[PDB]
């Protein structure tokens, strides 16, 4: 019973690895040898946002590249203004332990999650003027890790009980549940088409999930440790992943294998959050040794090093027009780099 | 450009109101001392502090509030979560101390507790935090030894060749046999803690039980040790 299934499962995984090796005609770095290098990219701290009490775990830009939500462990959700360093809102949270925050594409709602395994949506267009809990979603068992808005009606969440759900905000129930992962699902990254997403779990395997169908299409098994953050390439045909083994990796949705690996011998610290740029030439990686390296996505060589934080860079964001790059670390300050 | 100047006045006024509120909360936040309660399922981690028992209830997390000598303490008991704990433990680096509770009655499950303690001690983000240790259910240890069959010497060969430490002070109404067992458990946790030799954090052992009122004062006193060592290290006295 259990031995014929696992033997069939092992012959299927040899077929997949034969496929992946037949398709591997060459590598990306050989092709890209006749490419002009980027050179040294030096960025300076244009702004510092000050006023948090505890460490800043996650943050998310707006679609107008103006207002960013920042989430902290003190129980405060502060909506910032990036140009004038003004706090346009400050929201007191029920649970002090927050692990994610999302900003709506219309700018009407903000969601937050955490160790209280409940996604809380806050309205920002109340006629009274006070922020209030619009609804609470208590379906998951494990902690809530990353949550992102598809629109004002449907939000996608990443729990810690190896399950991703598709929530409806109006009915308050789970539309589609994804139960493919075996390890703790760390973060999810929505596609620009908002039809697919990818989640990296702690089982060293990234999956490609269809929202409307409800099943995974592809499995990527190139890593060696816990996949911390995942981000799509801006065309929707590739993604990048950061893990604890100090290696960023680039994956293809068509070739179904790793294209390139971003590794250096001097740095052995983990990789917290990775965001592409607007063009996709610069890969930005928030490492665990208190600074950010600006990797070249086509040459695998560090342009430059963003050493401005006192503690580990917890999360990294890039505006939709690519104008600035904000990093939040565990010293409670948000540096805006340009 | 006159309308633009008027708009700036609006945002500036809003910022000032929000900023003053964040200062009032800053006073309350600094006065707040966070505590993480970690323990096994069999051991009574809920039974540790019966002094105040406010016991606010959330969905998964449990938070207990208790004040000692006008000093407010928040103790967060993590409840319904998945068994793997290597990712949500990173949140709790900002706490002042981590309360660890173990059950010494079951010797077979004691080994599991030692492994859990070793992982917490050697965790990179838990290096700054001190660990406050409670060796629960001491009364059960007394009654169990009287059976005549020594479980501990089976599970631990080191206890066939071990002497009572002269630094230890036994209670007068206890069997000397039972007192050897109590400190030998205690020494196991201290051997993991001395192996590292960081010097930034320490391990405070205590002999609690099921009916103890003094536990609130103990956690208060060990907090005084943790913040004094912090200042002393900062001025490089220690």
């Amino acid at each position: 019973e259990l031995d014929q299934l696992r033997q069939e499962a092992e012959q299927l995984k040899n077929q997949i690895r034969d496929a992946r090796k037949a398709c591997a005609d060459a590598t990306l770095s050989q092709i890209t040898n006749n490419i002009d290098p980027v050179g040294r990219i030096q960025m300076r701290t244009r702004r510092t946002l000050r006023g948090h009490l505890a460490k800043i775990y996650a943050m998310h830009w707006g679609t107008d590249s103006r207002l960013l939500v920042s989430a902290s462990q003190d129980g405060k959700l502060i909506i910032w203004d990036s140009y004038t360093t003004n706090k346009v809102h400050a929201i007191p949270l029920r649970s002090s332990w927050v692990m994610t925050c999302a900003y709506a594409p219309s700018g009407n709602y903000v969601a937050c999650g955490g160790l209280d395994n409940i996604c809380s949506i806050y309205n920002l267009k109340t006629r009274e003027g006070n922020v209030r809990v619009s609804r609470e979603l208590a379906g998951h068992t494990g902690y809530l890790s990353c949550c992102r808005f598809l629109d004002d009606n449907q939000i996608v969440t990443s729990s810690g009980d190896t399950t991703c759900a598709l929530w409806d905000i109006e009915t308050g129930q789970q539309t589609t549940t994804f139960t493919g992962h075996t390890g703790d699902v760390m973060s999810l990254s929505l596609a620009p088409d908002t039809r697919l997403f990818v989640s990296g779990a702690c089982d060293a395997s990234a999956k490609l999930w269809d929202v409307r169908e409800g099943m995974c299409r592809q499995t990527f098994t190139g890593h060696e440790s816990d996949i911390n953050a995942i981000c799509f390439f801006p065309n929707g045909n590739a993604f990048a992943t950061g893990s604890d083994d100090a290696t960023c990796r680039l994956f293809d949705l068509r070739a179904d294998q790793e294209l390139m690996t971003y590794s250096h011998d001097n740095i052995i610290c983990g990789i917290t959050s990775v965001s592409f740029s607007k063009s996709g030439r610069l890969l930005l990686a928030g490492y665990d040794d208190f600074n950010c390296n600006v990797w070249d996505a086509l040459k695998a060589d560090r342009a430059g090093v963003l050493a401005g934080h006192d503690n580990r860079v917890s999360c990294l964001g890039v505006t939709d027009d690519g104008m600035a790059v904000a990093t939040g670390s565990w010293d409670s300050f948000l540096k805006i780099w340009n | 450009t006159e309308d633009q100047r008027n708009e700036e006045k609006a945002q500036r006024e809003a910022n000032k109101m929000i900023e003053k509120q964040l200062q009032k909360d800053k006073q309350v936040y600094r006065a707040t001392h966070r505590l993480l309660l970690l323990g096994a399922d069999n051991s009574g981690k809920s039974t540790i502090v019966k002094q105040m028992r406010i016991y606010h209830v959330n969905s998964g997390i449990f938070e207990t509030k208790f004040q000692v000598d006008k000093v407010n303490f928040h103790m967060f008991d993590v409840g319904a979560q998945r068994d793997e704990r290597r990712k949500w433990i990173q949140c709790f680096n900002d706490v002042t101390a981590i309360i660890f509770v173990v059950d010494s009655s079951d010797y077979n499950r004691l080994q599991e507790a030692l492994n859990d303690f070793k992982s917490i001690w050697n965790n990179k983000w838990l290096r700054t935090i001190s660990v406050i240790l409670f060796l629960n259910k001491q009364d059960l240890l007394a009654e169990k030894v009287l059976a005549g069959k020594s479980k501990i010497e089976d599970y631990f060969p080191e206890f066939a060749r071990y002497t009572t430490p002269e630094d230890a002070t036994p209670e007068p109404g206890e069997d000397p046999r039972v007192t050897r067992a109590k400190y030998f458990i205690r020494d196991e946790f201290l051997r993991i803690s001395t192996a590292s030799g960081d010097g930034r954090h320490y391990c405070y052992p205590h002999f609690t039980c099921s009916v103890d009122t003094e536990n609130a004062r103990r956690i208060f006193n060990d907090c005084r040790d943790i913040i004094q060592r912090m200042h002393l290290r900062q001025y490089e006295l220690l």
Epitope: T162, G183, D203, A204, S225, D244, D245, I268 | E84
Partner: nanobody, 128 residues
Framework: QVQLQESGGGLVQPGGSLRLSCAAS????????MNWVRQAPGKGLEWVSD????????SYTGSVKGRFTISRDNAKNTLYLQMNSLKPEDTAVYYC?????????????????????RGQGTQVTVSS
């Protein structure tokens, strides 16, 4: 793909000898601390023993201390466990386990709810 393949075992006798071969494929073997974990029938997982990257620091479980040799070859990419002086009460399934982070000394691998850095295990029965 991280993969662990155990090898050796089967029905044996108490007091005999047995070598457990563990094959680690899909990662760099010298960077990660590795360790042994077993599961008794009708019981939970228990940490057998461990070995560091270089192989200097070696610790054991008390109730089976002095009865098991742990060899960790870096070049061969194999983890050997020597099992002499067996006991009929010490019969279980043996799973190779790997700590999830490189160059570290903390490990969380006693989880029974689908820990995804272990092998399929080998059945080792002792009949008196």
């Amino acid at each position: 793909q991280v993969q662990l393949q155990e090898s050796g075992g089967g029905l044996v006798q108490p007091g005999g000898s047995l070598r457990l071969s563990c094959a680690a494929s899909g990662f760099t073997f010298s960077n990660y601390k590795m360790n042994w974990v077993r599961q008794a029938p009708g019981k939970g997982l228990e940490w057998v023993s461990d070995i560091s990257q270089s192989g200097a620091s070696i610790s054991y479980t008390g109730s089976v201390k002095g009865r098991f040799t742990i060899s960790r070859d870096n070049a061969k990419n194999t983890l050997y466990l020597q099992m002499n002086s067996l006991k009929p009460e010490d019969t279980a399934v043996y799973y190779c386990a790997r700590c999830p982070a490189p160059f570290t000394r903390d490990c969380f691998d006693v989880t029974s709810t689908t820990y995804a850095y272990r092998g399929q295990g080998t059945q080792v029965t002792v009949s008196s």
